[PDB]
Amino acid sequence: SDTGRPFVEMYSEIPEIIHMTEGRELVIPCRVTSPNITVTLKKFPLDTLIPDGKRIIWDSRKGFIISNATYKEIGLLTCEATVNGHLYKTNYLTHRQTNTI
């Protein structure tokens, strides 16, 4: 919803703890109702994970699909979207799961 909230799903208060593993298909689930809106995938503080559309494939109806996760996706990611003159955001803490690399 433009005059409501772009995201289908968002964090509550605590960032979404994604128990990831390197080399795997890391989806950051911050999809939007209308693809037109177009989300920008930041990382704390003001880093920018540009959706290259090769490895980092921006599926508006699923999430940001980093086909092969790396150290560049280990931290506090922040999906951001300015809509009706209002900045919405949602946070995703990408934790290296205690399984392997």
Method: NMR
Please give the single-letter amino acid code of residue 53.
G
Distances (CA, A) of 65 to 1, 3, 49, 62, 75: 23, 27, 11, 8, 16
**Which residues, in sequence order, are bridge partners of residue 91?**
78
Residues 6+ apart with CB under 8 A from 94: 18, 20, 26, 28, 69, 73, 74, 75, 76, 77
Q: What is the largest CA-CA distance in the chain?
A: 43
Q: 34: helix, coil or strand?
A: coil
Any idea where the domains of the chain sit in the sequence?
Answer: 1-101
Would strands 26-28 and 63-66 be described as parallel, antiparallel, or unpaired?
antiparallel
Collapsed DSSP state (helix, strand, coil) of residue 73: helix
Structure tokens at 67: 């086909």
Please say whether the structural domain 1-101 has been given the CATH code 2.60.40.10: yes
Amino acid in position 27 = V
| 15, 23, 55, 71, 79 from 19: Cα distances, Å | 12, 13, 19, 14, 18
